[PDB]
Design a protein around this ligand. Structure first.
Ligand SMILES: O=C(Nc1ccc(F)cc1)C1(C(=O)Nc2ccc(Oc3ccnc4c3Oc3ccccc3N4)c(F)c2)CC1
Length: 284
């Protein structure tokens, strides 16, 4: 890539988080995923002391479009100041002489939250699942305090580390590793379906859908609804049904997250408080 063609403010931000190429070993034989625009590999990052850090290494497939390259780097820069236990962090960006720049993330042992709760070999309790939702709410409370609007909050975009800590994330250009200007319409607030604008209050709607994903252990929402009909479906006066093991107060929280008026949906601060209380009523 020719750095001189990129936005100078973007390049300066990248240099503040740069990883030297010799400190990063990309295991091209160990692929985490491949999509149309990017791919992700296992990697080993060496710090100044020689300690090996297991990481995921995200790459573009092509480097010929300045728009794709700029967007790919911007995704990494957007993350750079996220410092919270429930938000995925950025290890850095490796600029190489040849090939794609590399976005380097701490490796998440248990992958994405949706596949984790769908895996019949794991047995999270109701309390565990509510705990996962509480952790997401805490990450979103942090992001909302930075005035950051996520725009694609969903279980598929949350990661789980080796301690089962949930990290809010966004696969971004690697999201295709559903969407139908490809939009996750079944997670979108009614006003966003109509205007395609997003706010923290539309993230709250998406969070309510994520809670429903948790309480169903990863069922697809609105499975019998055509993607282009979801607005009509909702406007008939409908919401996702209460899952069988979802406690009544948590379903009430979901219904508040789906309030027809964005301004009346609870803040993520309120959601953390309310879900903390519900969580605490469970022994296990
Ligand atoms: O997250 C982002 N931005 C952002 C936005 C909002 C926010 F609040 C926080 C963050 C970005 C990004 O690229 N995110 C991203 C996420 C997850 C990835 O995949 C990983 C990452 C680590 N280890 C796992 C690997 O996937 C797996 C799959 C299966 C089994 C195991 C793993 N392991 C990835 F490569 C990249 C866009 C910059």
């Amino acid at each position: 890539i020719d750095l001189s063609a990129l936005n100078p403010e973007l390049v300066q931000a990248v240099q503040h988080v740069v990883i030297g190429p010799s400190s990063l070993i990309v295991h091209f034989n160990e692929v985490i995923g491949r999509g149309h625009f990017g791919c992700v590999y296992h990697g080993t990052l060496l710090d100044n002391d020689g300690k090996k850090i297991h990481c995921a290494v995200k790459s573009l497939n092509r480097i010929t479009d300045i728009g794709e390259v700029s967007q790919f780097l911007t995704e990494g820069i957007i993350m750079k100041d996220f410092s919270h236990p429930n938000v995925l962090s950025l290890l850095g960006i490796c600029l190489r002489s040849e090939g794609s720049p590399l976005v380097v993330l701490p490796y998440m042992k248990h992958g994405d939250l949706r596949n984790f709760i769908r895996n019949e070999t794991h047995n999270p309790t109701v309390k565990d699942l509510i705990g996962f939702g509480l952790q997401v709410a805490k990450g979103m409370k942090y992001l909302a305090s930075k005035k950051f609007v996520h725009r694609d909050l969903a279980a598929r975009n949350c990661m789980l580390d080796e301690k089962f800590t949930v990290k809010v994330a966004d696969f971004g250009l690697a999201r295709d590793m559903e969407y139908y200007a490809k939009l996750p319409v079944k997670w979108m607030a009614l006003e966003s379906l109509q205007t395609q604008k997003f706010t923290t209050k539309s993230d709250v709607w998406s969070f309510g859908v994520l809670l429903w994903e948790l309480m169903t252990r990863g069922a697809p929402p609105y499975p019998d609804v055509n993607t282009f009909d979801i607005t009509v479906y909702l406007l008939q006066g409908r919401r996702l049904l209460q899952p069988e093991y979802c406690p009544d107060p948590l379903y009430e929280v979901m219904l508040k997250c789906w309030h027809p008026k964005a301004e009346m949906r609870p803040s993520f601060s309120e959601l953390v408080s309310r879900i903390s209380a519900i969580f605490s009523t469970f022994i296990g």
